Enzyme design. Sequence first.
Site, PDB file in Angstrom:
ATOM      1  N   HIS A 121       1.608   2.976   6.419  1.00 57.72           N
ATOM      2  CA  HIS A 121       1.614   2.528   7.815  1.00 57.72           C
ATOM      3  C   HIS A 121       2.968   1.972   8.261  1.00 57.72           C
ATOM      4  O   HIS A 121       3.260   1.929   9.456  1.00 57.72           O
ATOM      5  CB  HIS A 121       0.498   1.506   8.068  1.00 57.72           C
ATOM      6  CG  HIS A 121       0.729   0.180   7.414  1.00 57.72           C
ATOM      7  ND1 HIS A 121       0.333  -0.092   6.122  1.00 57.72           N
ATOM      8  CD2 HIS A 121       1.316  -0.950   7.874  1.00 57.72           C
ATOM      9  CE1 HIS A 121       0.666  -1.334   5.816  1.00 57.72           C
ATOM     10  NE2 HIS A 121       1.264  -1.876   6.862  1.00 57.72           N
TER      11      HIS A 121
ATOM     12  N   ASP B 215      -3.137   4.203   1.571  1.00 54.94           N
ATOM     13  CA  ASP B 215      -2.103   3.691   2.484  1.00 54.94           C
ATOM     14  C   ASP B 215      -0.754   3.549   1.767  1.00 54.94           C
ATOM     15  O   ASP B 215      -0.082   2.522   1.862  1.00 54.94           O
ATOM     16  CB  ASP B 215      -2.551   2.366   3.127  1.00 54.94           C
ATOM     17  CG  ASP B 215      -1.564   1.840   4.161  1.00 54.94           C
ATOM     18  OD1 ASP B 215      -0.899   2.648   4.839  1.00 54.94           O
ATOM     19  OD2 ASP B 215      -1.457   0.606   4.297  1.00 54.94           O
TER      20      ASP B 215
ATOM     21  N   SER C  72       4.300  -6.192   4.729  1.00 53.13           N
ATOM     22  CA  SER C  72       3.736  -5.007   4.089  1.00 53.13           C
ATOM     23  C   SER C  72       4.764  -4.300   3.213  1.00 53.13           C
ATOM     24  O   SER C  72       5.811  -3.864   3.696  1.00 53.13           O
ATOM     25  CB  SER C  72       3.198  -4.039   5.133  1.00 53.13           C
ATOM     26  OG  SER C  72       1.932  -4.453   5.598  1.00 53.13           O
TER      27      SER C  72
END
Length: 152
Positions: free
Chosen positions: A29, A51, A103
């Site tokens: 992402h 992901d 992230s």
Amino acid sequence: DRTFAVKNEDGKIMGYAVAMEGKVIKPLHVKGTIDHPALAKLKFTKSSSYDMEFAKLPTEMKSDAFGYTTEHPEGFYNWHHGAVQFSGGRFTIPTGAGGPGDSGRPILDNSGKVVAIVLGGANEGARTALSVVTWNKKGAAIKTTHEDTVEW
């Protein structure tokens, strides 16, 4: 240096990539280009299930790469913003310690080995349960997603 910023067109950090075990690893992402000359234009393989996307680590690095460990006893671990608790199959931090841009940051033990990759967090008041990617002894990836996770 083993952690790299993923920057968009303006230059804003959107997340992070790690050099770990012959690989370049970043969350899927996290949009943008890796801010490193050796890493910017690599061929990435994507995995929507976990992901995660990865590339074969440039053979100029190799010695600059994290080791991963399947050993996560219950206790406290390290990440850029402080302590990460591992308890009841859950990585937690104090709410506020993690947010957008985090992230891709690795969670490390005191020996400096990676135990998990941060994807985001679910706010539970005082604590935030982290959504992560881990790897079992078979080498299989495991995505641990919590109820109402915010992608970072």
